[PDB]
Design a protein around this ligand. Structure first.
Ligand SMILES: Nc1[nH]c(=O)nc2c1ncn2[C@H]1C[C@H](O)[C@@H](COP(=O)(O)OP(=O)(O)OP(=O)(O)O)O1
Ligand code: NA
Ligand code: NA
Length: 156
């Protein structure tokens, strides 16, 4: 059995558009995603998600709603990534480029799947339908899924 590390992912989903951020530097630059990062000691997962959204995009929100959980396994990495996925309930400011992320709005008929993580093609449609989900994806490298499971759930 493997150990897991907690991460968050936040999607600012509005009726006609979604905010994504492009990772700018280091390895993995060039992919659009929601905003998030590692949960820290003592904070709830939801509070860590709010913190990462603020650090990465400049947006503050009072509340999130949990929509899914996705476990990622990478060949050659013994530690699993346990990603808790949230959507914002309202936003109150403008996104700001940081050094980790360049935020950009996308219309919901222009979701940039080819420039997102491959797994997003599977679970993000559920997110768009306002469904809740559990997923697992095993990757070889950054691009190749070797195994995955995805299930709609009534409770995350
Ligand atoms: N396959 C995948 N699909 C997806 O949709 N999001 C993924 C993903 N793999 C990783 N992520 C997300 C989870 C999280 O939001 C982010 C990874 O977090 P990071 O390691 O950048 O966190 P931190 O910035 O806290 O870490 P440090 O560099 O240690 O500060 O990418
Ligand atoms: Na962090
Ligand atoms: Na990061």
């Amino acid at each position: 059995m493997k150990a897991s590390r907690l991460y968050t992912l936040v999607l600012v989903l509005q009726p006609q558009r979604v905010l994504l951020g492009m990772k700018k530097r280091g390895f993995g630059a060039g992919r659009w995603n929601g905003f998030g990062g590692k949960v820290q000691e003592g904070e709830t997962i939801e509070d860590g998600a709010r913190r990462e959204l603020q650090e990465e995009s400049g947006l503050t929100v009072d509340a999130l709603h949990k929509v899914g959980q996705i476990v990622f396994e990478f060949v050659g990495e013994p530690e699993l990534m346990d990603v808790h996925v949230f959507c914002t309930d309202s936003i109150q400011g403008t996104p700001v480029e940081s050094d980790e992320m360049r935020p950009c709005w996308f219309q919901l008929d222009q979701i940039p799947f080819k420039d997102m993580w491959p797994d997003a093609s599977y679970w993000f449609p559920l997110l768009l339908q306002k469904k809740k989900f559990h997923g697992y994806f095993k990757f070889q490298g950054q691009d190749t899924i070797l195994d995955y499971t995805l299930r709609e759930v009534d409770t995350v």
